[PDB]
Write a protein that binds this ligand. Structure first.
Ligand SMILES: [Zn+2]
Lengths: 364, 283
């Protein structure tokens, strides 16, 4: 699909609250101002927060829950300039448009909104929040924003839920809103969620797609994100095998700890290697068995880079097809075998020994 | 697999072993985590099932209980459950075995006394023994029940949509009052079990409001649950399995063979049901 001509998208996380100010009465050519205005929302609940008094510009304002019709379904929606129309955080494609250019103000780029005239007015929120799981707690209703308003200012320990019927779209939407408001918050509060969560990891993958979609036009934020199960358990094991001064210690802790030492050894930590290894997709990717995603790692002013596989000269395909090859006069099977026999003899070892000659890329 | 809390309890010593243990119902999955045996032995109640119609013979059912308190007792005797205010005196815990008292103080979150006793026990041989492990396993069970849901998901939804008004059916019963407001206070395990134990007198759905009794069988209480009528003399509660007067001024009743004539006719039971206020449901 695409956005029909004469419609525009404004993203702002602030639109998680209704931006009563911004909208202005549309008018047709000939200055035919249309003070009749109608607005559409995910639920009747949305209406309860929205105030007619904010719009003296208009004499006539109405609001309804959107519903996805059938018969009007068209790439080109029906037109009715006789009323201004607005959709606020709409979920699904709209079949009808108001006066002049219609505009939508939404937090989230749906796939429907891809091929579209879009603006973001974005800003970085530096503060990454966090999850935590213990298995005191604030019970936060999993949908209603302002039911717990100012509680989300006061506390940092937020329990979440959902009802069985909930549309996954609604789930994503609410989670997005919560994360935006958290990134506005001044301290990293802790998520806790009472759900089987496998589908939540699926929805996280969706979020990854979404964030990429944004980044197609985005602010290139350093937004924090993590694999949430494979990684999770692995790092847990890592800590367990180490001393555990804080079982609650954030991964980024260990990350930066290794950062302290990477450059002096000019070679890649196994932690980071297993990262981008055991993600389903953004890794060696068991999704498609793609270790080919070797990391080329560079630092300021370097004449050289660190590949997955040793030092490399800059901006070149990771390994020369020609080389000072591993000439078979070394790595002759026979020699390897003889050495192996020697070794096994000496060790008195019956089993479990294998050896392989080393190999070299651009540099030795 | 067994999940009755009393089945989880184990004796500290070979003597006072938990013979007369939880019945097979401990294995069953009503989600009450209590054998009806212990429900009797500690609370004078027996669980029952209410069948319900899904507007149809198509199965719908809900758990209920009868109380066992006699018609004549008053005060403490009528109290079915205490508050944290008064559980100590109601139970006379020192009568009860130390592990029992432990568990109760855990239920009431008397962590001060709980950990005081724990700290005394630490170096005792019986507690360097795995009794500590036992207690922390019961703690993990509590986590798996409450932190998973009871004050969490269950509290959330009960405070989101499908609340029951555990409230006076008719405001003239001011002796009941807004004591439903006190439901907020109790530990989530207790709140859950209470909800599971007591039926509403009403249910609203888009299909109608359904009235399951004319007049409430109970009343809300100043500390914990107390068997009493909202109004009037207490309705006669019979009871089923010493220098006392036992006069019964019976009618002479010479009409023998009464049951040999009547036995086909329906033998209407008598045990007291439990009703309170209104439940609300969407589809
Ligand atoms: Zn039991």
């Amino acid at each position: 699909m695409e956005c029909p001509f004469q419609i525009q998208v404004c993203i702002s996380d602030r639109f998680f609250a209704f931006p009563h100010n911004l909208v202005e009465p549309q008018s047709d050519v000939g200055n035919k101002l249309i003070e009749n205005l109608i607005v559409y929302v995910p639920t009747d609940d949305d209406r309860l927060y929205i105030d007619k008094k904010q719009f003296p510009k208009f004499n006539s304002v109405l609001v309804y829950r959107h519903e996805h019709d059938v018969n009007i379904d068209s790439r080109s929606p029906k037109k009715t300039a006789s009323a201004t129309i607005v959709y606020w955080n709409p979920l699904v494609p709209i079949t009808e448009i108001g006066a002049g250019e219609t505009r939508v103000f939404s937090v989230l780029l749906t796939n429907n909104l891809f091929y579209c005239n879009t603006m973001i007015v974005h800003h970085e929120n530096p503060k990454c929040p966090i999850e935590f799981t213990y298995p005191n707690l604030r019970p936060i209703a999993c949908e209603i924003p302002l039911s717990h308003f100012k509680e989300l200012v006061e506390s940092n320990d937020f329990l979440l839920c959902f009802n069985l019927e909930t549309s996954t779209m609604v789930k994503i939407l609410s989670l997005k809103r919560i994360f935006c408001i958290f990134q506005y918050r001044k301290q990293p509060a802790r998520y806790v969620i009472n759900l089987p969560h496998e589908e939540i990891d699926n929805l996280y993958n969706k979020l990854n797609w979404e964030r990429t979609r944004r980044l197609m036009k985005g602010d290139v934020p350093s937004n924090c994100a993590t694999v949430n199960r494979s990684s999770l358990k692995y790092i847990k094991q890592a800590q367990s095998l180490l001393g555990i001064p804080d079982y609650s210690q954030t991964v980024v802790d260990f990350v930066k700890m290794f950062q302290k030492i990477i450059f002096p050894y000019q070679l890649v930590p196994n932690v980071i290697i297993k990262l981008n290894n055991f993600d389903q997709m953004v890794s060696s990717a068991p999704n498609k068995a793609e270790p080919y995603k070797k990391i080329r790692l560079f630092c300021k002013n370097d004449s050289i880079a660190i590949s997955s596989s040793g030092i490399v000269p800059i901006n070149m395909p990771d390994f020369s097809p020609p080389n000072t090859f591993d000439y078979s006069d070394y790595a002759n099977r026979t020699n390897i075998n003889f050495v192996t026999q020697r070794v096994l003899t000496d060790g008195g070892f019956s089993s479990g020994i294998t050896v392989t000659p080393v190999k070299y890329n651009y540099y030795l | 697999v067994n999940r009755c809390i009393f089945a989880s309890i184990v004796s500290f010593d070979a003597c006072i072993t938990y013979k007369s243990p939880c019945s097979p119902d401990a294995y069953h999955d009503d989600g009450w985590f209590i054998c009806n045996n212990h429900l009797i032995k500690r609370f004078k109640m027996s669980k029952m099932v209410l069948p319900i119609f899904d507007e149809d013979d198509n199965q719908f059912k809900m758990t209920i209980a009868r109380h066992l308190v006699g018609n004549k007792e008053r005060g403490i005797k009528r109290i079915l459950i205490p508050s944290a205010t008064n559980y100590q005196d109601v139970f006379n815990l020192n009568s009860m075995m130390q592990a029992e008292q432990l568990i109760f103080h855990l239920i009431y979150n008397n962590e001060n006394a709980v950990n005081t006793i724990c700290d005394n026990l630490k170096y005792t041989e019986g507690f360097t023994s795995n009794t500590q492990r036992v207690i922390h396993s019961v703690y993990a069970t509590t986590k798996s029940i409450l932190d998973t849901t009871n004050p969490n998901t269950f509290c959330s939804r009960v405070s989101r949509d499908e609340l029951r008004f555990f409230d006076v059916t008719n405001a003239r019963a001011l002796r009941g009052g807004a004591g439903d407001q006190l439901f907020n206070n109790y530990s989530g395990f207790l709140q859950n079990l209470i909800r599971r134990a007591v039926a509403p007198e009403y249910l609203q759905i888009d299909t109608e409001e359904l009235r399951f009794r004319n007049c409430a069988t109970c009343i809300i209480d100043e500390t914990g649950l107390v068997a009493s009528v909202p109004d009037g003399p207490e309705l006669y509660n019979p009871i089923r399995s010493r220098l006392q007067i036992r006069n019964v001024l019976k009618f002479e009743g010479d009409t023998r063979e009464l049951d040999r004539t009547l036995s086909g006719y329906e033998e209407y039971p008598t045990y007291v049901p439990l009703f309170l206020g209104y439940q609300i449901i969407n589809s």
